[PDB]
Amino acid sequence: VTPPPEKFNFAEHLLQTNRVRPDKTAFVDDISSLSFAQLEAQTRQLAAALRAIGVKREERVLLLMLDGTDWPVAFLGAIYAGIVPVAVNTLLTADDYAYMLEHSRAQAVLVSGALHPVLKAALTKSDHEVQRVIVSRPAAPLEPGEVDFAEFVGAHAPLEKPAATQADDPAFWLYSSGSTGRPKGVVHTHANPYWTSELYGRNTLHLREDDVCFSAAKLFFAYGLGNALTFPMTVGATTLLMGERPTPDAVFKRWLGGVGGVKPTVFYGAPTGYAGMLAAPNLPSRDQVALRLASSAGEALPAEIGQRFQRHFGLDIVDGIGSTEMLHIFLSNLPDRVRYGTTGWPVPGYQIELRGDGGGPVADGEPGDLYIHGPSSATMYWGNRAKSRDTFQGGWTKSGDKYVRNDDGSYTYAGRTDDMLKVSGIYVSPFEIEATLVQHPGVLEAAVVGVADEHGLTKPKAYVVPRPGQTLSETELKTFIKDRLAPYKYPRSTVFVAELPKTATGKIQRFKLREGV
């Protein structure tokens, strides 16, 4: 792969690539479609609109939007203007967005109408710098000063040239969270999505122009931003976008061509979703679908899920690991070489190391902490120098995973070096769940650990000590939390216990709980 040039604007690079196919569909969702030519026009009009309201080069805008054809207009339009979109999870609380507005110093917000209520609460409570709120597909009347996305874009002539950015300039941020503390702003450059799209989208997956891409992972996840924006636009594939929560039925509807007259050829999602599909009574047959490739990431793929999928569809599931810090996948199975129970082999272009307890070498078959060296790594966590130093070794990125290298050069997942749990392939901190539980007046103490379900997928499990002299049923506790946590964070089971195993300092011995004590 040839490196990008030093003067490089990634949005211009994706528009230029598709000038050969102006009338092909670039994106289609449940109510709209853009051709490459329409996407270019709207992208450049939005770039002009952001500049016309005073947002300058290098400044941030918050992009809080459901998957749909306006999302890549917003993302690429900011980048074309050399403004930095901060693309965020759509399932967070007002308090999380308030933090993001302050931390990013976002100067504008591009928000889906269905997300406007949570955004409103974030704006009201924060010391933010937002100059304009631009609403895509409003779901209630606009407040004074707010502008509808379609009119904001339509009111401005297309910007004539992109910002003259450098390849190593910041282009966008994503946020990721650890087991405590606020979300961390992961800063990516213009070159980083070129590298992931060339080294993985093109050179590993072999995506091509005639593909129809469909990602159950949304565009704000680093996995989905590659799958359903940067990879397809790099090869001129058409992309199906879906705003609603991915369920088996919603996904099957699109597999069978129920939206936009298109059947996906490339599907993308978490192992939890593939298990949910394989359990569904109305799983389509082979002859009803056009899939040629199935990608998975976010959590380890249990071998039995890959094997059942291959037996049903005659397609393997290609499991690769990526992170928000590395932007996309750097260690993966290949479309034509899958070994289930491993994450495959290093993606050419990326170097992988396993380190022991002092940074030293680890013999094959022994676990070591995983470190990555490659060209798409983030530059830092914005405004967090300590956490940055810890993760950005020195050209090496620490992943927070342990791995074992096998005799054939493949790597087998061996768990995290922290307490985080990927449930449904999405981060869940057990300590957040514990903090929610102990605010119930009938709970005295709680401890949450990961436990493998019957499919070998990790789910949280809660051990709860009730407060003597209060009542507390399992049903009452399920109601308390349904209300306060996202569904993927719900404990699979709660066990009421008389006491928890502790050190003399009172530290809970969470390892004893995973050992089944």
State in angstroms the smallest separation of the CB of 305 from ligand OOB: 12
- Which residue minimizes CB distance to ligand OOB? 322
Pick 51 or 308: Cβ nearer ligand OOB: 308
Annotated binding residue at 395?
no
Cα–Cα distances in Å, from 251 out to 208, 270, 277, 307, 309?
Answer: 22, 13, 9, 20, 15
Pick 173 or 413: Cβ nearer ligand OOB: 413
- Candidates 59, 299, 316, 369; binder of ligand OOB (CB under 6 A) is 299
State in angstroms the smallest separation of the CB of 229 from ligand OOB: 13
State in angstroms the smallest separation of the CB of 370 from ligand OOB: 8
Q: Does 456 bind ligand OOB (CB under 6 A)?
A: no
Q: Does 176 bind ligand OOB (CB under 6 A)?
A: yes
State in angstroms the smallest separation of the CB of 330 from ligand OOB: 9
Q: Does 324 bind ligand OOB (CB under 6 A)?
A: yes
Binding mask 383-412 toward ligand OOB (x if CB under 6 A, else -) reads ----------------xxx-----------
Q: Does 35 bind ligand OOB (CB under 6 A)?
A: no
161: left (phi over 0), alpha (psi -120 to 50) or beta: beta
Q: Does 298 bind ligand OOB (CB under 6 A)?
A: yes
Annotated binding residue at 516?
no
State in angstroms the smallest separation of the CB of 172 from ligand OOB: 14
- Virtual torsion, Cα 371, 377, 381, 386, nearest 10 deg: 30
Binding mask 339-378 toward ligand OOB (x if CB under 6 A, else -) reads ----x-----------------------------------
Q: Where are the alpha helices (DSSP H) in 418-516?
A: 430-437, 474-482, 510-514
Contact 372, 396 (CB under 8 A): yes
Nearest partner of 186 among 176, 197, 196, 171, judged by Cα: 176
Sign of CA dihedral 434, 438, 442, 445: positive
Phi, then psi, of 188 in degrees rounded to 5: -115, 150
- Candidates 110, 294, 329, 428; binder of ligand OOB (CB under 6 A) is 329
26: left (phi over 0), alpha (psi -120 to 50) or beta: alpha
Token pair 């941020």 in the structure block, residue: 173
Structure tokens at 387: 């956490």
Opening angle at CA 107, ends 102 and 109, nearest 5: 90
Pick 322 or 349: Cβ nearer ligand OOB: 322
SS3 at position 304: helix
Nearest partner of 220 among 117, 38, 90, judged by Cα: 90
Q: Does 213 bind ligand OOB (CB under 6 A)?
A: no
Q: Does 269 bind ligand OOB (CB under 6 A)?
A: no
Which residues lie near ligand OOB (CB under 6 A)? 176, 222-223, 297-300, 319-324, 328-329, 343, 399-401, 413, 416, 422, 427
Indicate the annotated binding residues for AMP: 298, 319-320, 324, 401, 416, 422
Indicate the annotated binding residues: 298, 319-320, 324, 401, 416, 422
